[PDB]
Coordinates of C-alpha atoms in Angstrom, one line a residue:
Chain A
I1 CA -33.8 -61.0 20.4
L2 CA -35.2 -58.0 20.5
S3 CA -31.7 -55.5 20.8
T4 CA -30.8 -57.7 17.9
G5 CA -33.6 -56.8 15.5
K6 CA -33.2 -53.5 16.4
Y7 CA -29.5 -53.1 15.6
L8 CA -30.9 -54.9 12.3
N9 CA -33.9 -52.6 11.0
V10 CA -31.6 -49.3 11.7
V11 CA -29.1 -51.1 9.4
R12 CA -32.1 -52.1 7.2
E13 CA -33.1 -48.2 6.8
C14 CA -29.2 -46.8 6.2
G15 CA -28.8 -48.9 3.2
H16 CA -30.7 -52.4 2.9
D17 CA -28.1 -54.2 1.4
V18 CA -25.5 -53.2 4.5
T19 CA -26.8 -55.9 7.2
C20 CA -24.6 -56.8 10.1
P21 CA -25.0 -60.2 10.4
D22 CA -23.8 -61.6 6.6
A23 CA -22.2 -64.8 6.3
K24 CA -23.9 -66.0 9.3
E25 CA -27.5 -66.8 8.2
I26 CA -27.7 -70.4 10.0
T27 CA -31.1 -72.0 10.3
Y28 CA -32.8 -72.8 14.1
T29 CA -32.8 -75.9 15.3
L30 CA -35.2 -78.2 17.1
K31 CA -34.2 -79.1 21.2
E32 CA -35.4 -78.5 24.6
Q33 CA -32.3 -76.5 25.4
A34 CA -29.7 -75.6 23.0
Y35 CA -31.8 -72.9 21.0
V36 CA -30.4 -70.6 23.5
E37 CA -27.0 -71.3 22.5
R38 CA -27.9 -70.5 18.9
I39 CA -28.9 -67.0 20.2
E40 CA -25.6 -66.6 22.0
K41 CA -23.7 -66.9 18.6
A42 CA -26.3 -64.6 17.1
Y43 CA -25.8 -61.9 19.4
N44 CA -21.7 -61.9 19.7
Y45 CA -21.3 -61.5 15.8
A46 CA -23.9 -58.8 15.4
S47 CA -23.1 -56.1 17.6
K48 CA -19.2 -56.6 17.0
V49 CA -19.6 -55.8 13.4
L50 CA -21.8 -53.3 14.4
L51 CA -19.5 -51.7 16.6
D52 CA -16.3 -51.3 14.5
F53 CA -18.2 -49.9 11.7
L54 CA -19.6 -46.8 13.4
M55 CA -16.4 -46.4 15.3
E56 CA -13.6 -46.7 12.8
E57 CA -15.3 -46.6 9.6
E58 CA -17.5 -43.8 10.4
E59 CA -15.1 -41.9 12.7
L60 CA -17.5 -41.8 16.3
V61 CA -14.5 -41.5 18.3
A62 CA -13.2 -38.5 16.4
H63 CA -16.9 -36.5 17.1
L64 CA -16.2 -37.4 21.1
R65 CA -12.6 -35.5 20.8
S66 CA -14.5 -32.5 19.0
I67 CA -16.6 -32.3 21.6
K68 CA -14.3 -32.4 24.5
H69 CA -11.9 -30.0 22.5
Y70 CA -15.0 -26.9 22.9
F71 CA -17.0 -28.3 25.8
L72 CA -14.9 -29.6 28.1
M73 CA -11.7 -27.2 26.7
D74 CA -9.2 -29.9 25.9
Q75 CA -7.2 -27.9 23.0
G76 CA -7.3 -24.4 24.7
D77 CA -5.0 -22.3 21.6
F78 CA -8.1 -21.7 19.1
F79 CA -10.3 -21.5 22.3
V80 CA -8.4 -18.6 24.0
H81 CA -8.6 -17.1 20.9
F82 CA -12.2 -17.5 20.4
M83 CA -12.5 -16.7 24.3
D84 CA -10.8 -13.3 24.1
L85 CA -13.1 -12.5 20.7
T86 CA -16.6 -13.2 22.9
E87 CA -15.1 -10.9 25.5
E88 CA -15.6 -7.7 22.9
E89 CA -19.2 -8.8 21.9
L90 CA -20.2 -10.0 25.3
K91 CA -19.5 -6.4 27.1
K92 CA -22.7 -5.4 26.3
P93 CA -26.9 -6.8 26.6
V94 CA -27.2 -9.4 23.8
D95 CA -28.7 -8.5 20.9
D96 CA -29.9 -10.8 17.6
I97 CA -27.0 -9.8 15.4
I98 CA -24.6 -11.0 17.7
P99 CA -24.7 -14.7 17.2
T100 CA -24.1 -13.9 13.5
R101 CA -20.9 -12.1 14.7
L102 CA -19.3 -15.0 16.9
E103 CA -19.7 -17.8 14.2
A104 CA -17.4 -14.8 12.2
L105 CA -14.7 -14.8 15.3
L106 CA -15.2 -18.4 15.9
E107 CA -13.8 -19.7 12.8
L108 CA -11.5 -16.8 12.9
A109 CA -10.0 -18.2 15.5
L110 CA -10.2 -22.1 14.2
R111 CA -8.4 -21.5 11.2
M112 CA -5.7 -19.1 12.3
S113 CA -4.7 -22.6 14.2
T114 CA -4.5 -24.7 11.0
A115 CA -5.9 -28.3 12.6
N116 CA -6.2 -31.3 10.4
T117 CA -9.5 -32.7 12.4
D118 CA -11.3 -29.2 11.8
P119 CA -14.0 -30.7 9.5
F120 CA -15.0 -32.2 13.1
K121 CA -15.5 -28.8 14.3
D122 CA -17.6 -27.2 11.7
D123 CA -20.5 -29.5 12.8
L124 CA -20.5 -27.1 16.0
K125 CA -22.9 -24.3 16.3
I126 CA -23.5 -21.5 18.8
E127 CA -26.2 -20.6 20.8
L128 CA -26.8 -17.6 22.4
Chain B
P1 CA -15.7 -3.7 -28.7
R2 CA -13.7 -2.8 -25.7
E3 CA -10.8 -2.2 -27.4
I4 CA -7.7 -0.5 -25.4
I5 CA -4.9 1.2 -26.9
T6 CA -1.9 1.3 -24.8
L7 CA 0.7 3.9 -24.9
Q8 CA 4.0 2.6 -24.1
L9 CA 6.5 5.8 -23.4
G10 CA 9.9 6.5 -22.3
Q11 CA 13.1 4.6 -21.2
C12 CA 11.3 2.7 -18.4
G13 CA 7.6 2.7 -19.6
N14 CA 9.0 0.7 -22.9
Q15 CA 10.5 -1.9 -20.6
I16 CA 7.7 -2.5 -18.4
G17 CA 5.2 -2.9 -21.7
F18 CA 7.7 -5.3 -23.5
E19 CA 7.1 -8.2 -20.9
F20 CA 3.6 -7.0 -20.3
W21 CA 2.8 -8.2 -24.0
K22 CA 5.4 -11.2 -23.3
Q23 CA 3.0 -12.0 -20.3
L24 CA 0.4 -12.2 -22.2
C25 CA 1.1 -15.3 -25.1
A26 CA 1.8 -17.5 -22.3
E27 CA -1.8 -17.3 -20.4
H28 CA -3.3 -17.3 -23.8
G29 CA -1.7 -20.2 -24.8
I30 CA -0.2 -19.0 -28.0
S31 CA 3.3 -18.3 -29.7
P32 CA 4.5 -14.4 -30.5
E33 CA 5.0 -16.1 -34.2
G34 CA 2.5 -19.0 -34.3
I35 CA -0.4 -20.9 -33.1
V36 CA 0.7 -24.6 -31.9
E37 CA -1.7 -25.0 -28.9
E38 CA -5.5 -25.4 -29.2
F39 CA -5.8 -23.9 -25.8
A40 CA -6.5 -20.4 -27.0
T41 CA -10.1 -20.8 -27.3
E42 CA -11.4 -23.6 -25.5
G43 CA -9.7 -22.3 -22.0
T44 CA -9.8 -18.6 -23.0
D45 CA -13.3 -17.5 -23.8
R46 CA -11.4 -13.9 -25.2
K47 CA -8.5 -12.5 -26.5
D48 CA -9.1 -9.8 -28.6
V49 CA -9.4 -6.9 -25.6
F50 CA -5.8 -5.8 -25.6
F51 CA -4.8 -7.7 -28.8
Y52 CA -5.5 -6.8 -32.4
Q53 CA -8.6 -8.6 -33.7
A54 CA -6.8 -11.6 -36.2
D55 CA -6.6 -11.9 -39.5
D56 CA -4.7 -15.2 -40.2
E57 CA -5.0 -16.1 -36.0
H58 CA -2.2 -13.4 -35.5
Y59 CA -3.5 -11.4 -32.2
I60 CA -1.4 -8.1 -33.2
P61 CA -0.7 -6.4 -30.0
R62 CA -1.9 -2.6 -30.0
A63 CA 0.9 -1.0 -29.1
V64 CA 2.9 2.0 -29.5
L65 CA 6.6 2.6 -28.4
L66 CA 7.9 5.9 -28.6
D67 CA 11.5 7.1 -26.7
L68 CA 14.3 9.4 -27.5
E69 CA 16.6 6.8 -26.3
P70 CA 17.1 4.1 -29.3
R71 CA 19.0 1.5 -26.5
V72 CA 15.6 0.4 -25.3
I73 CA 14.5 -0.6 -28.8
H74 CA 17.6 -2.1 -29.6
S75 CA 17.1 -4.9 -27.2
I76 CA 14.0 -5.7 -28.3
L77 CA 14.7 -6.9 -31.9
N78 CA 16.8 -9.6 -31.1
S79 CA 14.5 -11.2 -28.5
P80 CA 11.9 -14.2 -30.2
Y81 CA 9.2 -11.9 -29.1
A82 CA 9.8 -9.0 -31.3
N83 CA 8.2 -10.6 -34.6
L84 CA 4.8 -10.3 -32.8
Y85 CA 5.3 -6.2 -32.8
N86 CA 5.0 -5.1 -36.3
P87 CA 7.6 -3.0 -38.2
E88 CA 5.1 -0.4 -39.7
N89 CA 2.8 0.4 -36.6
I90 CA 5.4 2.5 -34.6
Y91 CA 8.6 2.6 -36.5
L92 CA 10.8 0.8 -39.1
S93 CA 14.3 0.0 -38.6
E94 CA 16.6 2.4 -37.4
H95 CA 14.8 4.8 -35.1
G96 CA 16.1 7.3 -33.0
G97 CA 15.4 10.5 -31.3
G98 CA 17.0 13.3 -29.3
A99 CA 20.7 13.7 -27.5
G100 CA 19.1 13.9 -25.1
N101 CA 18.1 14.8 -21.3
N102 CA 15.5 17.5 -20.9
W103 CA 12.4 17.7 -19.5
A104 CA 11.8 20.3 -21.9
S105 CA 13.3 18.3 -24.7
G106 CA 10.5 16.5 -24.7
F107 CA 7.7 19.2 -24.2
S108 CA 9.4 21.2 -27.0
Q109 CA 9.3 18.1 -29.4
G110 CA 6.0 17.4 -29.5
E111 CA 4.7 20.0 -31.8
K112 CA 7.9 19.7 -34.3
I113 CA 7.0 16.1 -35.2
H114 CA 2.8 17.0 -34.5
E115 CA 2.1 16.2 -38.0
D116 CA 3.6 12.4 -37.2
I117 CA 2.8 11.8 -33.7
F118 CA -1.4 12.0 -34.9
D119 CA -0.7 10.1 -37.8
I120 CA 0.4 6.6 -37.2
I121 CA -1.6 6.3 -33.4
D122 CA -4.7 7.2 -34.9
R123 CA -4.8 4.8 -37.6
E124 CA -5.6 1.9 -34.8
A125 CA -8.3 4.3 -33.3
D126 CA -10.8 3.7 -36.2
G127 CA -10.0 -0.1 -36.0
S128 CA -12.9 -0.6 -33.7
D129 CA -16.0 1.7 -33.7
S130 CA -16.3 1.8 -29.8
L131 CA -12.8 2.7 -28.4
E132 CA -12.3 2.5 -24.6
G133 CA -10.1 4.5 -24.1
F134 CA -6.0 5.1 -23.9
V135 CA -3.8 4.2 -21.5
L136 CA -0.3 6.0 -21.1
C137 CA 2.2 3.3 -19.7
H138 CA 4.9 6.0 -19.1
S139 CA 7.4 6.8 -16.6
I140 CA 8.0 9.9 -14.1
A141 CA 11.7 9.1 -13.5
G142 CA 14.2 10.8 -16.5
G143 CA 12.7 13.6 -19.0
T144 CA 12.3 11.1 -21.9
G145 CA 9.1 9.3 -20.2
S146 CA 8.1 12.8 -18.1
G147 CA 8.9 15.6 -21.0
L148 CA 7.0 14.0 -24.3
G149 CA 4.2 12.3 -21.7
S150 CA 3.0 15.7 -20.7
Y151 CA 2.1 16.7 -23.8
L152 CA -0.1 13.6 -25.0
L153 CA -2.2 14.4 -21.7
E154 CA -3.8 17.6 -23.1
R155 CA -4.4 17.0 -26.9
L156 CA -5.6 14.0 -26.5
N157 CA -8.0 15.6 -24.2
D158 CA -10.4 17.2 -26.6
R159 CA -9.5 15.5 -29.6
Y160 CA -10.9 12.6 -27.7
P161 CA -13.3 13.8 -24.9
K162 CA -15.5 10.6 -24.4
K163 CA -12.5 8.0 -24.0
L164 CA -11.0 6.5 -20.6
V165 CA -7.8 8.0 -19.4
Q166 CA -6.5 6.0 -16.5
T167 CA -2.4 5.5 -16.5
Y168 CA -0.1 3.0 -15.0
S169 CA 3.2 5.1 -14.0
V170 CA 5.9 4.4 -12.1
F171 CA 7.2 6.5 -9.4
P172 CA 11.2 7.4 -9.5
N173 CA 13.7 6.6 -6.6
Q174 CA 14.6 9.3 -3.9
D175 CA 17.5 7.4 -2.3
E176 CA 20.5 10.2 -3.7
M177 CA 20.2 13.1 -5.9
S178 CA 24.1 12.1 -7.7
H179 CA 23.2 11.1 -11.2
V180 CA 20.2 13.0 -11.5
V181 CA 19.2 16.0 -9.7
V182 CA 16.3 17.3 -12.1
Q183 CA 14.2 14.6 -10.3
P184 CA 12.0 17.3 -8.1
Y185 CA 11.4 19.6 -11.3
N186 CA 10.4 17.0 -13.9
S187 CA 8.3 14.6 -11.5
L188 CA 5.9 17.6 -10.5
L189 CA 4.9 18.8 -13.8
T190 CA 3.9 15.4 -15.3
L191 CA 2.1 15.5 -11.4
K192 CA 0.1 18.1 -12.3
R193 CA -0.9 17.0 -15.8
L194 CA -2.1 13.7 -13.9
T195 CA -4.7 15.3 -11.8
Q196 CA -6.4 17.9 -14.1
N197 CA -5.5 16.6 -17.1
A198 CA -6.0 13.1 -16.5
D199 CA -8.9 11.4 -14.5
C200 CA -7.2 8.6 -12.9
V201 CA -3.5 7.0 -11.8
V202 CA -1.6 4.0 -10.8
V203 CA 1.0 4.5 -8.5
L204 CA 4.3 2.7 -8.2
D205 CA 6.9 3.4 -6.5
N206 CA 10.6 2.7 -6.7
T207 CA 11.5 3.2 -3.1
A208 CA 8.9 0.3 -2.2
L209 CA 10.4 -2.1 -4.9
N210 CA 13.7 -2.7 -3.5
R211 CA 11.6 -3.1 -0.2
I212 CA 10.0 -5.8 -1.6
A213 CA 12.8 -7.1 -4.0
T214 CA 14.9 -8.1 -0.8
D215 CA 11.9 -9.3 1.3
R216 CA 11.3 -12.9 -0.5
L217 CA 13.4 -12.5 -4.0
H218 CA 16.9 -12.5 -1.9
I219 CA 19.0 -10.7 -4.0
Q220 CA 22.4 -8.6 -2.9
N221 CA 23.1 -6.4 -6.0
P222 CA 19.5 -4.5 -7.1
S223 CA 19.7 -4.5 -11.0
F224 CA 16.9 -2.9 -13.2
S225 CA 16.4 -6.9 -14.5
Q226 CA 14.1 -7.4 -11.6
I227 CA 11.9 -3.9 -11.8
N228 CA 10.0 -5.9 -14.9
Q229 CA 9.0 -8.9 -12.7
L230 CA 6.5 -7.0 -10.2
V231 CA 5.2 -4.6 -12.6
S232 CA 4.4 -7.3 -15.2
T233 CA 2.1 -9.4 -13.2
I234 CA -0.1 -7.1 -11.8
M235 CA -0.8 -5.2 -15.1
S236 CA -2.3 -8.6 -16.5
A237 CA -3.9 -9.1 -13.2
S238 CA -5.9 -6.0 -13.3
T239 CA -7.3 -7.1 -16.6
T240 CA -8.7 -10.7 -15.7
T241 CA -11.9 -9.2 -15.4
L242 CA -11.9 -7.8 -18.7
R243 CA -9.3 -10.4 -20.3
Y244 CA -10.8 -13.4 -19.0
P245 CA -14.6 -14.2 -18.8
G246 CA -16.3 -12.2 -15.9
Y247 CA -19.5 -10.2 -15.3
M248 CA -19.2 -7.4 -12.8
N249 CA -16.6 -4.6 -13.6
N250 CA -15.4 -6.8 -16.5
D251 CA -14.3 -2.9 -18.5
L252 CA -11.7 -0.9 -17.6
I253 CA -14.6 1.7 -16.9
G254 CA -15.7 -0.8 -14.8
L255 CA -13.1 -0.9 -11.9
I256 CA -12.2 2.8 -11.8
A257 CA -15.9 4.1 -11.5
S258 CA -16.2 2.0 -8.0
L259 CA -13.3 3.5 -6.2
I260 CA -12.8 6.8 -7.2
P261 CA -14.5 9.6 -4.6
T262 CA -13.7 12.4 -6.8
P263 CA -11.5 14.1 -9.3
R264 CA -8.1 14.8 -8.3
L265 CA -8.3 11.9 -5.7
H266 CA -7.5 8.8 -7.7
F267 CA -4.2 7.7 -6.2
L268 CA -4.6 4.1 -5.9
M269 CA -2.8 1.8 -3.5
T270 CA -1.6 -1.8 -5.3
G271 CA -1.1 -4.7 -3.0
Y272 CA 0.2 -8.4 -4.7
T273 CA 1.4 -11.3 -2.2
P274 CA 2.4 -14.5 -3.9
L275 CA 5.8 -14.3 -5.5
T276 CA 7.2 -17.3 -4.2
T277 CA 7.9 -20.3 -6.0
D278 CA 8.7 -22.8 -2.9
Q279 CA 5.0 -22.5 -2.0
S280 CA 3.8 -24.7 -4.9
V281 CA 4.7 -27.5 -2.6
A282 CA 2.0 -26.9 0.0
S283 CA -0.6 -25.6 -2.2
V284 CA -1.9 -29.2 -2.7
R285 CA -3.8 -29.5 0.4
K286 CA -6.6 -27.0 -0.9
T287 CA -5.0 -24.0 0.7
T288 CA -8.4 -22.1 1.4
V289 CA -9.7 -18.5 0.8
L290 CA -10.0 -17.3 4.1
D291 CA -6.1 -16.5 4.8
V292 CA -5.7 -14.7 1.8
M293 CA -7.4 -11.3 2.5
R294 CA -6.2 -11.4 5.8
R295 CA -2.9 -10.1 4.9
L296 CA -4.0 -7.4 2.1
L297 CA -5.1 -5.0 4.4
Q298 CA -2.4 -5.3 6.7
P299 CA 0.7 -3.4 5.5
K300 CA 3.3 -6.0 4.1
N301 CA 2.2 -6.0 0.5
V302 CA 1.9 -2.7 -0.2
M303 CA 3.9 -0.6 -3.0
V304 CA 3.2 3.0 -1.2
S305 CA 6.0 4.6 0.8
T306 CA 3.7 5.9 3.7
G307 CA 3.6 6.6 7.4
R308 CA 2.7 3.8 9.6
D309 CA 1.8 6.4 12.5
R310 CA -0.6 8.1 10.1
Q311 CA -3.4 5.4 9.9
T312 CA -5.3 6.7 12.6
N313 CA -6.7 9.6 11.5
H314 CA -6.7 8.7 8.0
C315 CA -9.9 6.5 6.5
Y316 CA -10.5 3.9 3.6
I317 CA -13.1 4.6 1.4
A318 CA -12.6 2.4 -1.7
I319 CA -10.7 -1.2 -0.8
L320 CA -10.8 -3.6 -4.1
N321 CA -9.4 -7.5 -3.2
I322 CA -9.2 -9.5 -6.4
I323 CA -9.1 -13.2 -6.1
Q324 CA -7.9 -15.4 -9.4
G325 CA -8.2 -18.5 -10.4
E326 CA -9.2 -21.3 -8.0
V327 CA -11.7 -19.4 -5.7
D328 CA -14.0 -22.0 -4.0
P329 CA -16.3 -19.3 -3.9
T330 CA -18.5 -21.3 -1.3
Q331 CA -16.4 -19.4 1.3
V332 CA -15.8 -16.2 -0.7
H333 CA -18.5 -14.5 1.3
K334 CA -17.1 -16.6 4.6
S335 CA -14.0 -14.4 4.2
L336 CA -16.1 -10.8 4.0
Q337 CA -17.6 -12.4 7.0
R338 CA -14.1 -11.5 8.6
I339 CA -13.8 -7.8 7.4
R340 CA -16.1 -6.1 9.7
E341 CA -14.7 -7.7 13.3
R342 CA -11.2 -6.6 12.8
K343 CA -11.8 -3.1 11.2
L344 CA -8.8 -3.0 9.7
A345 CA -10.0 -0.5 7.4
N346 CA -10.6 2.9 8.9
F347 CA -14.2 4.0 7.5
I348 CA -14.8 7.2 6.5
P349 CA -17.2 9.2 9.2
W350 CA -19.2 11.1 6.9
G351 CA -20.4 8.2 4.2
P352 CA -20.5 4.4 3.6
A353 CA -17.7 2.1 2.3
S354 CA -16.9 -1.1 0.5
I355 CA -14.9 -3.7 -0.2
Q356 CA -15.5 -5.1 -3.3
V357 CA -14.5 -8.9 -3.7
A358 CA -14.6 -10.2 -7.8
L359 CA -13.4 -13.7 -9.4
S360 CA -12.5 -14.5 -12.4
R361 CA -10.8 -18.1 -14.1
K362 CA -7.1 -17.9 -14.9
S363 CA -5.1 -19.5 -17.7
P364 CA -5.3 -23.6 -18.1
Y365 CA -1.5 -23.7 -16.8
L366 CA 0.0 -25.5 -14.1
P367 CA 1.3 -22.4 -11.8
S368 CA -1.9 -20.4 -12.7
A369 CA -4.8 -23.7 -11.8
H370 CA -3.0 -24.3 -7.8
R371 CA -2.0 -21.5 -6.4
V372 CA -4.1 -18.6 -4.9
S373 CA -3.5 -15.2 -6.3
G374 CA -4.5 -11.7 -4.8
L375 CA -4.9 -8.4 -5.7
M376 CA -5.2 -5.2 -4.3
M377 CA -6.3 -2.3 -5.5
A378 CA -6.7 0.2 -2.5
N379 CA -7.3 3.8 -2.0
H380 CA -6.9 5.3 1.5
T381 CA -5.9 8.7 2.2
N382 CA -2.6 8.5 3.6
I383 CA -1.0 9.3 0.1
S384 CA -1.0 13.1 1.2
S385 CA 2.6 11.5 2.7
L386 CA 4.0 10.7 -0.8
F387 CA 2.8 14.4 -1.8
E388 CA 4.3 16.1 1.2
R389 CA 7.5 14.1 0.7
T390 CA 7.7 15.4 -2.9
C391 CA 6.6 19.2 -2.1
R392 CA 9.4 19.3 0.8
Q393 CA 11.6 18.0 -2.0
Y394 CA 10.8 20.8 -4.4
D395 CA 10.8 23.9 -2.4
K396 CA 14.4 23.0 -0.7
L397 CA 15.7 23.0 -4.2
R398 CA 14.1 26.2 -4.9
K399 CA 16.0 28.0 -2.5
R400 CA 19.9 26.3 -3.0
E401 CA 19.4 28.0 -6.7
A402 CA 19.4 24.9 -8.1
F403 CA 18.3 24.3 -11.9
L404 CA 16.8 28.5 -12.1
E405 CA 19.1 29.5 -14.6
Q406 CA 20.1 26.2 -16.2
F407 CA 16.2 25.7 -17.1
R408 CA 14.7 28.4 -18.2
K409 CA 16.7 29.2 -21.8
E410 CA 14.3 27.1 -23.8
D411 CA 10.6 27.7 -24.0
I412 CA 10.1 29.0 -20.2
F413 CA 9.6 32.6 -20.0
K414 CA 7.4 33.0 -16.8
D415 CA 8.0 31.1 -13.2
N416 CA 5.2 28.1 -13.6
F417 CA 6.8 26.7 -9.9
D418 CA 4.0 27.8 -7.7
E419 CA 1.5 26.8 -10.4
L420 CA 2.5 23.4 -9.6
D421 CA 2.9 24.0 -5.7
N422 CA -0.4 25.7 -5.0
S423 CA -2.3 22.6 -6.9
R424 CA -0.5 20.0 -5.2
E425 CA -1.6 21.9 -1.6
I426 CA -5.1 21.7 -3.2
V427 CA -4.9 17.8 -3.4
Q428 CA -3.5 17.5 -0.1
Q429 CA -6.0 19.8 1.2
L430 CA -8.8 18.3 0.2
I431 CA -7.8 14.9 1.0
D432 CA -8.1 15.7 4.9
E433 CA -11.1 17.9 4.1
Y434 CA -12.6 14.8 2.4
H435 CA -13.7 13.1 6.2
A436 CA -15.5 15.7 7.8

């Protein structure tokens, strides 16, 4: 009952009408045993309808793919173009104006590889 | 205000200006004989900058067309776009000319019709009290456009001294020399007048036309009906800041001022990529501006025959990259971000360079408000390769005793051949000296 209301406050702070346990607001019971079975149906729907909204309707499964394509270096076609393009700028000690030029060659290696999940790769920043 | 008088002249200069005015009605939303669409004022915010200003909402063209050959004008009046032209501004019906094929013909005909050639073309000058200048839409090929066009570059230099002069001149073809043989003589005589008696030119090569006319256009027999399609679009493309409402370099003295390094160095390289109609089915997916200027500096859209291995010792000084219509201007600074990383333009080691990009909204039309367009106005110092090509074909012809007895009977008494040779080498030496 702690973790359910933790879910319910972070969906109340997002839209104040987009709450996960809608169409299930059935009142409590007076019983020595059966109020944990009342909680056992309140958990199972509230965390299930929270999963598919973030993962599918907000595409959280597509955000780890862009993490995989750069950190784990999976899709290497744009990456080795960019990795060859970090070579001509890191063949010298680092300066302040160099990370302003890495993002030039990053998105020059990106949109020459003409992908359609590229909006998920525009959330990537370069640290040097 | 900003009224320009176009000087269409010659056998080729009249046809490239005929569809230039025919291009302007399709983008202004107007008809050559009426006004049937209301898109002319709500969509286009300025129309009286090349046309004459209206008396009945009939935008008269500010154009004059003289030629010795009557064949180019007899293919005009049967077309339904000739009623927009006036039969009192230039000529009435049944206008003629010479016989005639000579550079010395039109050079000698300028001072015998001297009273009439400076009478009706000056009536359009005082229509606006602030005249922009004169563009000589003439030709170099043949003796018709080259003979008479060299005369008006001299007498309009002092009678109208405070006006801009700059021409869209087409270069002749140098493939074989059978039909014409007078091509090295009449070209260099006009090319001297294009540097000291003229401020700027816009070069348009003929051997580079069929390089593009078989590139994506897929023709088997090259005809003259394709020479007006590449030329008329880039003419209207060059005035998109001037015709359509722009802010910076919205005048013709705005664009040319930011590109010329010095006098006698004004030969501007032109580039224009989008000419294919089946690209239209894939521009619906937000084709961006980040890929259209990567191919401008790449020598693919150029209209200048130059050497491919001569670009390492030559340096760009001024390069113009004009985007039109839908630009998505939140990434136009992103396109200019990627320029310094490649260094596709060699920069001059003595001074700074400049990559100028500008935009203007196009016509309210479906092939215009959907597909990205890129107009290039380069200035590279490899242009002496054409001047080395024309000079090597000039001194080789004078040692073969060709047209030295057949050319000096009329109005030529002294040898003015080396007067053109040294001044051409002055251009070729000051270009290589310009990068110290």
